[PDB]
Write a protein that binds this ligand. Structure first.
Ligand SMILES: O=c1[nH]cc(F)c(=O)[nH]1
Ligand SMILES: O=c1[nH]cc(F)c(=O)[nH]1
Ligand SMILES: O=c1[nH]cc(F)c(=O)[nH]1
Ligand SMILES: O=c1[nH]cc(F)c(=O)[nH]1
Ligand SMILES: O=c1[nH]cc(F)c(=O)[nH]1
Ligand SMILES: O=c1[nH]cc(F)c(=O)[nH]1
Ligand SMILES: [K+]
Ligand SMILES: [K+]
Ligand SMILES: [K+]
Lengths: 245, 245, 242, 246, 248, 244
């Protein structure tokens, strides 16, 4: 195929230039199933991809897996195939008391607690979302009347210590991360996730457009682990996609 | 003699103002306040000249910051003590992309942190990112007046010379860190250089203050190092201030 | 389910204390089928987990996906469930001229060109493999007869720029990693992969045992993109560690 | 019609000047100049106000820098393009050692680099160290007039608030890096805080220029955070030190 | 006179030796050399005292490095210029784990880089890892001698005092970076403190030289700061000599 | 017995001494002490040879530090515990400026911190700066004897080879950080390279102790890589008299 990990060819994209990139492979089909003419493209490792049509235009929906490293592979390979706009949709844990489960978060930029971002730009470069993409996400949110918050997100290379979880095997957190939640909290950070800094950084420094939207599944001021609906963040990412085609 | 050590202002002076406009040049403070209703000179200490004015019935502050993040940080901190919650910076800048022309207006989504003052509010991992309401209000203001606008990332440097990789200087040398840097910022899509935005955006975004950033291009570095001897920016910032009140 | 991502209970493990952790979830069944009574436990996201028996004890085979981040999840949730020893098996790109495709590499310690490792120990801490696991892997390779190389591995958060590939959309590599492959080469580094730094660091810093073995699928002194002995080795090493 | 972009000055304006005295406050420039012979205003742009004067026959410049290392780097760079080789900074400062009183004079031998601009001239490992000749001139001037003097290390901060660990602020918080920091600089024997020295000293030491630094104490941080409302030994000392550095 | 600037040795002096044992203390060089055949004193300049001996028909060098990465880096480099390819460090150490006793033997797999010299050879991301053959020979040597042995990670510090979080000092102060650090290394499973291995291991691992590190514990930090002037064992010495047989 | 773990000295051995001259070479200690009154050998353990002597009726210590910051930090700490408050370092150095000649004397105002030990006393932002009274003494002493002197910044390196960008070495490689660095220090007016000043200067300046540093130039790196006098010794002893 045309790309090493994804197993896709330029032919599979049929002219698509926008991709919606969830973290979970099993969500790919459900997102594509909201659009016209969904067709499965390929399934390798953590990269599941579908093609669909939105207003007569081809759109790609491809999973990135968990974390910057695999995310960077999806974005890079999708870029080689002609994608220029990436809309990530994920799940997220909120760290502000006024943000509720079910709420929708739109990320203007990300605190860079990852490692892959640095493979694209030095630390001082901002992991900032594209203005057109963020606008579109914001305006989509309003059109469906979702409770939406816009601002900064913390993007961690780990789910546990980097998000200062203590309910773990070691029950311990390295110095850099000890007390860090309350720090990000005092600094207005809205939430924690694991892909945004890689996605936003590599795209802002390579001429690609990226936006990030997330559904709040747990509030960290209350508990550490989410319980066993996200549909809002999905309807919003598809509707923003339309405005960007 | 007042409520704040450097600005020489009292809370009574602001008369309930909650948004300030912050130029670099003390001289330009009067020119900007005069574009609004009931301009009243308040104080002038060191490089901190401040006027009060009125915009659609509500009090607004205009206050110069001087050159660079340290005096900018003084002025934002003291104005915030006096009740200011939204700051809009208007400035001049050197463009580093060929397609950007002298006279064009740049709106900054976020900045590369090539300064030190920002580090005094948030660690380097934190994004020097503009508020989304301010950025939107600038962009929509620039459209209302029909100015050539570019929206993106700005390199924000603690120096005018080596930090912007100028070689026509006394030493004629540039420290390793910055040698080759302008070409790198160019490849990453950075639009321009200036000296106050990293400090401004970081301190605001990490403390719950809203901040935007707009600038007029006075030189293009692809052509020359030093700008020529010589209004869009000012109109836009006043107009955005109106939309934000 | 007692853990958030893996969908596993302690009951599923039947007392297992050792896991073999490959990157590719489609490789978990093959590895498991080399052992006895292979059973499919769970499969969520990139985490596909099988249980089998070896040396008359329960063993876990569980995929981590690509990169430190999803690796740190698997290792932490398996640890919570009883796993004390982790045997990494992956694929890798060699950067030394004398290392051919089909060779087997055992990592003693890794260059930390990753981020997740810092969520466990500051950069000064070595990303070093456990000495028992490393021995068990090297002796297993001397018995299988494979061509083996032992040493330092460069563990990257990216497949492309971090490994100094230029045939990419941007064709660009950030200042940090520009010229970096020849640097590692000159420092004796054997190969590139993407998970070892995180695994080694989080394990060596929390009283867990880990080791790492990989089969070479490309040699970078020849090309950027690549056109079963490591599997037998990793299974035999686990046999010894039980 | 100038030779430099910010200061609005020509090399002819300096009339052979090779030593500059550099206060922070534009308004203090005339007053310092008048303490010497032939005081004449040169230019005034933004925070850079510049007067020429004469000291024992030799032309001298007095030029403000504004607050902070960024505007200091500019003024120093453009002055050096116009011929200045020696820079004497005169400022105000907040002491953090108990035995140092308001009204005392401080001569900096080197600064803690808590700024950003110094890094545009040298990496962190390089010392923001003052020139030995300037430092000697300042010390011997202070002793000649019998001013209470302290000689040693200064912490130079890119901010007035969080960097000098002030909590009486809008946010009321200080970032991890600076939390507990004032107590540390105290234990380390640091005399005081100010905002320009690290940049000035680093850029001059690494570019073959001579720099000296003397400051008046206007508040003691063991007593209070903000200096009160309100002899002149510091300014007297810098002009006296300049006579020896000519 | 000589071929190298500090050691005062010529290639001829080494008699074709390829392996060196490198203790810290000059006064220990003779003792270790005396354990082998035909001990001969080569040179003694500054803190570099070097003997040559014969182990199993092969020439071997014993050379003291002094305290710290800097002088260690000098010895190793000049010994390398003279043909030495394998380096075995033997020293004393202070344990930070409760279960490690005075007189116990420690074999370092890799080290925490709390030094400066290693950065002159390799960026911090690079592991200060011992050679796998050297480590193996040392562990097997320890088995044969029946020594109480622990294998693991060592913290290698540029100072004796603040870097190893000692407070009974002139200042009684430890800078923020090292404050609370001992207990952090303890929780990360680090066995001990010493002052040379990070530099030794790193400059060797990154320049195609083999190195291994063994040390005898002379104090336990969970008990006291300064070692008593005892349960001391010269096992380490025996271990390194026997390991040298395996590496020859 | 001993009060200090490495030096093997008790406070009784110092007899009130509060100043020490500290060379790198153990072998040099006796020759330096023999320039003063009533020289007596105190102890010699590993690389720390210590002598006591009198200068104008006052006891002074001469103690070797060995090569590098780590052992220097030991000798300084332990002497400090024994009552030493002022340290005068005398060393040898390689000049990196073409105008500085072999045999010239260098006085260090401050050091570029290319070591590791200095960081165990203060963060990197802190200046490795000499004490002004010691520097004044050294400079006026050098003026007193009539030696060719340069005053300024020194580069203090944790290695002799790569940190000082020497390429004639086993691997003939220099890691990225130090590649091109000598030319950089040269352009920043750095005078010279040695290996102990950053540590001695930072630990003394952050702990209320006085330190000065003077060095004799034995090689000029613009001319050659490896070196192939006595003025710095005169100066550090003469300066010792002024600090007493
Ligand atoms: O990285 C995260 N993803 C989802 C979550 F709910 C969370 O808390 N953290
Ligand atoms: O900081 C800057 N301000 C204005 C300019 F024109 C420029 O190039 N740089
Ligand atoms: O991380 C990597 N995995 C597989 C490879 F072939 C390679 O070169 N790098
Ligand atoms: O930067 C400062 N200048 C003057 C002062 F009094 C102070 O405390 N800080
Ligand atoms: O570096 C050290 N060597 C020996 C010891 F006993 C100790 O505690 N630290
Ligand atoms: O550290 C050094 N000491 C002495 C020298 F001659 C030299 O070049 N470098
Ligand atoms: K200013
Ligand atoms: K993954
Ligand atoms: K030594």
């Amino acid at each position: 195929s045309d790309v090493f990990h994804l197993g896709l060819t330029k032919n599979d994209l049929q002219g698509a230039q926008l991709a919606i990139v969830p973290g979970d492979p099993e969500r790919v089909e459900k997102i594509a199933a909201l659009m016209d003419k969904p067709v499965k493209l390929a399934s390798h490792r953590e990269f599941t991809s579908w093609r669909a049509e939105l207003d007569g235009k081809a759109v790609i929906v491809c999973s990135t897996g968990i974390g910057g490293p695999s995310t960077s592979i999806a974005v890079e390979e999708l870029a080689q195939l002609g994608i220029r706009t990436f809309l990530r949709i994920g799940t997220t844990g909120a760290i502000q008391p006024h943000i509720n489960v079910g709420d929708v978060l739109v990320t203007t930029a990300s605190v860079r607690l990852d490692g892959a971002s640095l493979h694209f730009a030095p630390m001082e470069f901002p992991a900032v979302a594209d203005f057109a993409c963020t606008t579109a996400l914001v305006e989509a949110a309003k059109s469906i009347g979702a409770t939406t918050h816009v601002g900064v997100t913390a993007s961690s290379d780990t789910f546990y210590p980097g998000q200062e979880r203590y309910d773990t095997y070691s029950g311990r957190v390295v110095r850099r991360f000890k007390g860090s939640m309350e720090e990000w909290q005092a600094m207005g950070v809205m939430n924690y996730e694991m892909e945004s800094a890689t996605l936003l950084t590599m795209c802002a420094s390579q001429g690609l457009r990226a936006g990030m939207v997330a559904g709040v599944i747990v509030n960290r001021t209350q508990q550490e682990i989410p319980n066993a609906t996200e549909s809002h963040a999905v309807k919003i990412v598809v509707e923003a996609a339309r405005r960007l085609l």
